Design a binder for this molecule. Structure first.
Ligand code: HEM
Ligand SMILES: [Cl-]
Length: 291
C-alpha cells in the first residue's frame, strides 16, 4: 500500500492560507460551543482521530483517504462527539470544495492549535480521498482505562517513541470529557482553550484521588476540580514517561517544539511525498495577518 501525496490541482500556499483563515475566523466567531470553550479542542481531537487509525504494519488507515467521511468510521464509538467538528468544517468545505477531506480534517487541527496560541505546526497538502472500501474497521483507537504498557505498546503501532507519546499527550490540557461521549466526566469546568504545558504541571502538582464516575469508570479527580484518565495518570506511574513529563512541566518551549514535530508526524503517517512535492507550509495566524 503506497499513498502518494498529490497536490490539489493548481493550488498553492496562498490557496491553503485561505482555508486556514476561514477556519480561524469561524473559530473566533462560534465561541459559544461547549459552554464557551469553542471548537478548538474538538478539532484537535478530530485531527488526531482520523490519523490514529494508521497501522504501520500494512499502511492501512491514517489521514490520507479522509475515510472519516464514511459511515463505518464516522459511527465509530471511539469517535463519539467528533460529529460536532465535522459539522463545523462542513460549510468550510462547501466554500473550498477543491480541498480533499483528509487535507481539511488535518488542517483544522493545525489551525486549532495555532489559533489557541500553540506552536506553529508545519503542514503538507496532498491527501487524496479514497473509496469507502478503504475505511479501516472500528477498534483501532486507544482505550482510556489502561496503563503505561498499553500506551507504550499502542503508540508503537504509529511509530511513536516515549518522547512523542508524552509530547502528544500534552493536548490533554485542552477541552474536556463528556459523559455521553466516552463515559468520563470533567473537568469541573473551567476547561481551558489556550495551548500551554498545563497538563504536565497539573499532573505533577495536584492531589489526585481515584474515583469511579457515574458511568462506572475510574478516573483521577483533583480537589481543584481537574481530572485525568487512567492512561493520562499512567504517565507519572512510568519512570521513563515521568521524567519527560517533568521536563515539559519545566520548559514550555521544549514542549512546544516536541509537540509540533510529533503532531506533524502523526498527521503525515503513511503518506509518501514525492521529491518534487512543495515543502511544508507554515501558516500565518489571523493575528499575524492583522485579521
Ligand atoms: C491513550 C491516548 C488517548 C486516549 C485514550 C484519549 C482519550 C480521550 C478521551 C476519552 C477524551 C474525551 C472524550 C469526550 O467525552 O468528549 C479525549 C479528549 C480529547 N482528547 Fe484524547 N486521548 C488520548 C490521546 C489524545 C491525543 C494524542 C490527543 C491529540 C494530540 C488528544 C486530544 C484530545 C482532546 C483535545 C480532547 C478534548 C476534546 C473535547 O474537549 O471535546 N487525546 N481524549
Ligand atoms: Cl482523544
Amino acid at each position: 500500500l503506497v499513498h502518494v501525496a498529490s497536490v490539489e490541482k493548481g493550488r498553492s500556499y496562498e490557496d491553503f492560507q485561505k482555508v486556514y483563515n476561514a477556519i480561524a475566523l469561524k473559530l473566533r466567531e462560534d465561541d459559544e460551543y461547549d459552554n464557551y470553550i469553542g471548537y478548538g479542542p474538538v478539532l484537535v481531537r478530530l485531527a488526531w482521530h482520523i490519523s490514529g487509525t494508521w497501522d504501520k504494519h500494512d499502511n492501512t488507515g491514517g489521514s490520507y483517504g479522509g475515510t472519516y467521511r464514511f459511515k463505518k468510521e464516522f459511527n465509530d464509538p471511539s469517535n463519539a462527539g467528533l460529529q460536532n467538528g465535522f459539522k463545523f468544517l462542513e460549510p468550510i468545505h462547501k466554500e473550498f470544495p477543491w480541498i480533499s477531506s483528509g487535507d481539511l480534517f488535518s488542517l483544522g487541527g493545525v489551525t486549532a492549535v495555532q489559533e489557541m496560541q500553540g506552536p506553529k505546526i508545519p503542514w503538507r497538502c496532498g491527501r487524496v480521498d479514497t473509496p469507502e472500501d478503504t475505511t479501516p474497521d472500528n477498534g483501532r483507537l486507544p482505550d482510556a482505562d489502561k496503563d503505561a504498557g498499553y500506551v507504550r505498546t499502542f503508540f508503537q503501532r504509529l511509530n511513536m517513541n516515549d518522547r512523542e507519546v508524552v509530547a502528544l499527550m500534552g493536548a490533554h490540557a485542552l477541552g474536556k470529557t463528556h459523559l455521553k461521549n466516552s463515559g468520563y466526566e470533567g473537568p469541573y469546568g473551567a476547561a481551558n482553550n489556550v495551548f500551554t504545558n498545563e497538563f504536565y504541571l497539573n499532573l505533577l502538582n495536584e492531589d489526585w484521588k481515584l474515583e469511579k464516575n457515574d458511568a462506572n469508570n475510574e478516573q483521577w479527580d483533583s480537589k481543584s476540580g481537574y481530572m485525568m484518565l487512567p492512561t493520562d495518570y499512567s504517565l507519572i506511574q512510568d519512570p521513563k514517561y515521568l521524567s519527560i513529563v517533568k521536563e515539559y512541566a519545566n520548559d514550555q518551549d521544549k514542549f512546544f517544539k516536541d509537540f509540533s514535530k510529533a503532531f506533524e508526524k502523526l498527521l503525515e503517517d503513511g503518506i509518501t511525498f514525492p521529491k518534487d512535492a512543495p515543502s511544508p507550509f507554515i501558516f500565518k495566524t489571523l493575528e499575524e495577518q492583522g485579521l
